């Protein structure tokens, strides 16, 4: 295998885009209940993401390229200064500000991509 | 994005030997190799060799083998980003050829085909 369940945590992006399906397993009386709460707040927790990934058109991808292209205003740092020396932990911590910003553009990409594939299929 | 202090100006005679330190701040000193070169009255700019604080590896070019003791220390965790070590250089036949001005430099990136290019330099110290 490699690394494991988080084992690039520290690693250059570059390495840790390979292999994602390693934290996409393991991602889904008094004891009792706050077992079984502990259990309805994963389920909840994972779909909001699936739910994400439905209406960006990324549902069923672990690498999901888009249209929005990259403003720099966000981070004008290179390809190669990111995938290989930033770490993941690293670089959303830099893009803590625009995140729920680009989250808007992807979904607005997705709704206006099926809008022009319902006129593609009329012919 | 951090300083790499050294030692002063420490001048001895030929045959001895010199240590050269290197102290880090303010980035992952385990992240980054670290690289010596030099400046001599005579030749130049000639690369010496790198280390990783890491890997604990030593590439050193073949003119500077049978001379050079480098070795690091083990940083100290300022925060989750940042820490503080320091590099050593020592040379064995040391001669009056060798004088000029040293220094170290932490490397480029972490990965790819320029990850030990020395990016960040020093400040210089002047040998014999």
């Known amino acids: 295998f490699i690394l494991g369940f988080l084992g690039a945590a520290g690693s250059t992006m570059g390495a840790a885009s390979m292999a994602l399906t390693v934290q996409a397993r393991l991602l889904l009386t008094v004891w009792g209940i706050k077992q079984l709460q502990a259990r309805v707040l994963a389920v909840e927790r994972y779909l909001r993401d699936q739910q994400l990934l439905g209406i960006w058109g990324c549902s069923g991808k672990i690498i999901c390229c888009t249209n929005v292209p990259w403003n720099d205003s966000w981070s004008n740092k290179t390809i190669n200064e990111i995938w290989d020396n930033m770490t993941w932990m690293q670089w959303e911590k830099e893009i803590d500000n625009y995140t729920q910003h680009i989250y808007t553009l992807l979904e607005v990409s997705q709704i206006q991509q099926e809008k022009n594939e319902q006129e593609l299929l009329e012919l | 994005q951090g300083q790499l202090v050294q030692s002063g100006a420490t001048t001895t005679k030929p045959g001895s030997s010199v240590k050269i330190s290197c102290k880090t701040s303010?980035?992952?000193?385990?992240?980054?190799?670290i690289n010596w070169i030099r400046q001599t009255a005579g030749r130049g700019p000639e690369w010496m060799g790198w280390?990783?604080?890491?890997?604990?590896?030593?590439?050193?070019?073949?003119?500077?083998?049978?001379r050079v003791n480098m070795t690091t220390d083990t940083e100290v965790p300022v925060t989750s980003f940042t820490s503080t070590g320091a590099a050593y250089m020592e040379i064995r036949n040391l001669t009056s050829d060798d004088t000029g001005t040293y220094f170290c430099?932490?490397?480029?990136?972490?990965?790819?085909?320029?990850?030990?290019?020395?990016?960040?330099w020093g400040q210089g110290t002047l040998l014999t």
């Open positions: 303010g980035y992952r000193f385990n992240f980054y190799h």
């Open positions: 430099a932490k490397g480029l990136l972490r990965d790819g085909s320029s990850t030990w290019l020395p990016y960040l």
């Open positions: 280390i990783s604080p890491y890997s604990g590896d030593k590439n050193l070019a073949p003119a500077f083998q049978d």
